[PDB]
Amino acid sequence: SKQLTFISAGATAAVLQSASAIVSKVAGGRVQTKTAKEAGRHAVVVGPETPIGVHTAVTEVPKSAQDPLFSGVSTVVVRAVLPRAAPDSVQLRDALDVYASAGIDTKEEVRSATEAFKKSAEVAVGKAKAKGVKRIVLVVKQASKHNCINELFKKISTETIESAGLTTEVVGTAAVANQLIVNPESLGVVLLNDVAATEQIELAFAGVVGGVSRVYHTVEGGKISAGHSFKSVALAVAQELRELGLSSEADKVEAAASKNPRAVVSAL
Amino acid sequence: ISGVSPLLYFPPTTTSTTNREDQINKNTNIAIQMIKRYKGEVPPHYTRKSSATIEQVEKEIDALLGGAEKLRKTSTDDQPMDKLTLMERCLRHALWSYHKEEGRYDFDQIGRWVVYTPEDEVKLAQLKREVEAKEKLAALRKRREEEGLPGGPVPRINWPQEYSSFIDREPVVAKRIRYDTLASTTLERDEKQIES
């Protein structure tokens, strides 16, 4: 009757097959599992690549699935995601910086980027206020090529955050990545500008913590789970089932993911 | 490069099958999109008042100027011009401007019937270099394809030196990934669709 929407973005067929087997075996057939390329609710996205229709890329450190190495850490990494066009078309994150060099007008693109950054900054400040932190850390790649997208990102994120009353500390990519992997307890909320390096950093943090599920906030309004490995996808499916209103099944999936990461389907 | 690295850097080839045709179709779609954005809107359509081909116009001009050859008299560049000279200059200037806009880049006549300003001479020289460079690049990129060398440019680097130079492998590995991906892609677009 119900429906879970599976989005595939750069994920090997093995991961998708494992996710399908897990949902079929756990749910028992009560909720169907359809595949698509875009969704707004009740959606699990598999693979490193960013799907179409997501504007924020928040990720946290769930208490249950904390690795013993990272026990007690609490830092929220929110990646700002600009609207995604078709693979052939030029993405906004690159158009906004190349058209300016070429002299082409960049008004509509700037407007769209401003809207996306405002939404991401609102999400980040909400998370920071909920956690109680006073300052957030902006992450911008300091390459000369990205001298316009990051400038707008700072100009808008700092504006919105200061309007909300919190402080912002800008930093590069290498230093923040090393600090997040080595000493993450010194960062409460870290926003990431939309670049490939920031996506890799978010994935690295989501994996090093022990494997977690990344939450995507879409344009339509809602939360869709995201995973890239067996354990991450299992946790994402568990969270999705919990959202649908299944507690025991979600707990079983979470326990199976904790015990046997790569073979959860057989474990449970 | 101090510190035993955990992995050996094999080439980043993971997309074993990446047809050159698809790459040169994506390059062409991106090229068309950018050109459309830069130019703006395709201009409003215009309906011709009269029907005539460029070849017919050129033949008519040649016939018109051919009957007055005996009457036409040359003179010094600083001396006043004649009616025949003025007509010839105007007609040839328009004809060769149309030809250069069309694509018939015959620089020998364009330099004669269109150059009247130092800015004009500079523009012609810039156009003269560009066309020759494109022709040479196309020929070189066809010969290279015949030989089998990578389509994209390859820098003159000695990575055994770079590994020793840098302390941390991460930037060096990233550079190798970028250049190995660049050398495995064909930075070519379809210059039929672009010209169309």
Added chain:
Amino acid sequence: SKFCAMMDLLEEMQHRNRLKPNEESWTWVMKECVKSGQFRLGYCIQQVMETECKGCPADLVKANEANAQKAKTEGKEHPGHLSQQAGLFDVKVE
């Protein structure tokens, strides 16, 4: 550079020792020019041999011409940066 060393040696021999280089020395220089691919020094040495010596060997001249033609066809006749258009304010004076 082998060519520079040999030319310096010839300069020493002729100027600071008063000994006229013979055909053998210039043939060695021409062979070095051909071997290294320097087809312009090849032309200069060819002219030198034609002037002082009793002509340049045909094989060396043909090899030098072959190198020059190969450079011309490949587009490496001159350094690329020299052919780049410049201007009054477009030249970087280091």
Added chain:
Amino acid sequence: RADEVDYTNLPAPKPQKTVWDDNIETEVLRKYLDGLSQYDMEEAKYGV
């Protein structure tokens, strides 16, 4: 027994600007290749 070493000192990674072979494909691409070299140097200096 005087000072031995400043363990908190790291010799900065001396960057090297990538040099491209001088062909027509480089003259046509000169601006793009220069941009790539600048990006490489920036990455080397900052770290990634």
Added chain:
Amino acid sequence: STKMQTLHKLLTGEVSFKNKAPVKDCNIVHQFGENWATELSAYAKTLPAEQQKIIVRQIARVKLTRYTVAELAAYCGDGPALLDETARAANIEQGVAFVKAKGVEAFEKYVAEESTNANWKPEEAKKFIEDVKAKAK
């Protein structure tokens, strides 16, 4: 005594490098030495329990920091404890693909060159090449 104190402060994050460079395993190995982990572990035993636990945790995190961000993202998806085996399997698969692509002798030469560049012991390189060859057939 000074070296151990400086290393402890650096790992704890109290004191950073001169240029604020990232505190990676490679930089620490460059400065302090190849066996900094062993001497630091021996020194930590002369400290209270909390400092010992912090030292162990920081050493583990630094060891995890020995991979590039891309490698961690691709291979550390299913936990850090399983990172090493996943990375080894991926590297072995890459070796098998290279062997099937461009022969064996060229593969042997390439592995030797990379081991020279990658600071690998001859024994480890020999084991890796033997393992990939055995995986092929």
